[PDB]
Scaffold this active site. Structure first.
Site, mmCIF file in Angstrom:
data_model
loop_
_atom_site.group_PDB
_atom_site.id
_atom_site.type_symbol
_atom_site.label_atom_id
_atom_site.label_comp_id
_atom_site.label_asym_id
_atom_site.label_seq_id
_atom_site.Cartn_x
_atom_site.Cartn_y
_atom_site.Cartn_z
ATOM 1 N N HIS A 233 10.826 -8.024 111.344
ATOM 2 C CA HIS A 233 10.196 -8.617 112.557
ATOM 3 C C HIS A 233 10.410 -7.653 113.717
ATOM 4 C CE1 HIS A 233 10.024 -12.158 110.049
ATOM 5 N NE2 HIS A 233 11.362 -12.131 109.952
ATOM 6 N N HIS B 14 17.424 -6.389 120.719
ATOM 7 C CA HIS B 14 16.179 -5.991 120.052
ATOM 8 C C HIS B 14 15.069 -5.955 121.088
ATOM 9 C CE1 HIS B 14 16.156 -10.380 120.164
ATOM 10 N NE2 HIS B 14 14.825 -10.171 120.463
ATOM 11 N N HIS C 128 10.589 -6.451 121.731
ATOM 12 C CA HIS C 128 9.228 -6.840 121.359
ATOM 13 C C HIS C 128 8.269 -5.854 121.990
ATOM 14 C CE1 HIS C 128 10.833 -10.796 120.096
ATOM 15 N NE2 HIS C 128 11.703 -10.572 121.114
ATOM 16 N N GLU D 299 6.963 -10.576 126.078
ATOM 17 C CA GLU D 299 6.890 -12.013 125.768
ATOM 18 C C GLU D 299 6.781 -12.769 127.076
ATOM 19 O OE1 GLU D 299 10.046 -12.770 122.810
ATOM 20 O OE2 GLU D 299 8.338 -12.637 121.487
ATOM 21 N N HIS E 4 15.592 -7.726 124.720
ATOM 22 C CA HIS E 4 16.413 -8.933 124.724
ATOM 23 C C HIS E 4 17.826 -8.575 124.306
ATOM 24 C CE1 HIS E 4 12.632 -11.501 124.092
ATOM 25 N NE2 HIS E 4 12.801 -11.177 125.424
ATOM 26 N N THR F 298 12.631 -17.035 120.821
ATOM 27 C CA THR F 298 11.169 -16.777 120.764
ATOM 28 C C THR F 298 10.724 -16.490 119.343
ATOM 29 O OG1 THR F 298 11.270 -14.400 121.192
ATOM 30 C CG2 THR F 298 11.239 -15.868 123.108
#
Ligand SMILES: [Zn+2]
EC number: 4.2.1.1
Length: 256
Positions: A61, A91, A93, A103, A116, A195
């Protein structure tokens, strides 16, 4: 079997994780005109001097940089928080293009990516217990815009070749997460969720107002990772972001 594709992405998550349609889901749009200054909010305390990084993992992911959280080495305190939250991992996104990937959004603006830094409340003893509590986690969110290289990110960019596919990990000791922070610790805060599945409503979100700048080459290297495992069909790890969820009965508070 969740992910970010047409068939298993955010619009599907509610069937296995009904809390996807709950009252305190993340991320959200931050309307800068509606967020109220809360003069009762303390400055954030980010104490990362003794942070002990261990490993970097491609989990199919994103990639997680994992820390030793067996003692109060790297902690977040103050701001909207009561007590002490221990760093366990960070990590990102990110998008397929520079115009999407974050996000959270700010007045509907999407950044290229979002960091994050995930912390758990030490009063619950372990991370697995903390995620079952409404004040179990504190996630520090930092926007990334494309511009100048972030020097403190390059050690992460450099190792991504070694964790291209799902389930690959590499040693990642002596990484200093202080090198990922912007100058200002001005923030927004609101109660929300993880999330990704299982989407638990256990997070105090702290989202920094000041983005960090990373280079086009840095973000391009994030986009060379793969969602798939070794010797499976190549699916580029891009657009691993959940879109903004309804604010419902929540207020976003500004520290500034
Ligand atoms: Zn995240």
């Amino acid at each position: 079997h969740w992910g970010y594709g047409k068939h298993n992405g955010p619009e599907h998550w509610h069937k296995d994780f009904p809390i996807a349609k709950g009252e305190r889901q993340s991320p959200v749009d931050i309307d800068t005109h509606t967020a109220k200054y809360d003069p009762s909010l303390k400055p954030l305390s980010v104490s990362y001097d003794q942070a002990t990084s261990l490993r970097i993992l491609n989990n199919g992911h994103a990639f997680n940089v994992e820390f030793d959280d067996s003692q109060d080495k790297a902690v977040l305190k103050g701001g909207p928080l009561d007590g002490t939250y221990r760093l366990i991992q960070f990590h990102f996104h990110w998008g397929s293009l520079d115009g999407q990937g974050s996000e959270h959004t700010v007045d509907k603006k999407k950044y290229a990516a979002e960091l994050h830094l995930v912390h758990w409340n030490t009063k619950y003893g372990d991370f697995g217990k903390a995620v079952q509590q409404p004040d179990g986690l504190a996630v520090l969110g930092i926007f990334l815009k494309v511009g100048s290289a972030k020097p403190g990110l390059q050690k992460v960019v450099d190792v991504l070749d070694s964790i291209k596919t799902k389930g690959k990990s590499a040693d990642f000791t002596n990484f200093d997460p202080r090198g990922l922070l912007p100058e200002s610790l001005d923030y927004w805060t609101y109660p929300g969720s993880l999330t990704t599945p299982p989407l638990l409503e256990c997070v105090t979100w702290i989202v920094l107002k000041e983005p960090i700048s990373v280079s086009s080459e840095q973000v391009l290297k994030f986009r060379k990772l793969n969602f798939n495992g070794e010797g499976e069909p190549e699916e580029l790890m891009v657009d691993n972001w959940r879109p903004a969820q309804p604010l419902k009965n929540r207020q976003i508070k500004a520290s500034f």
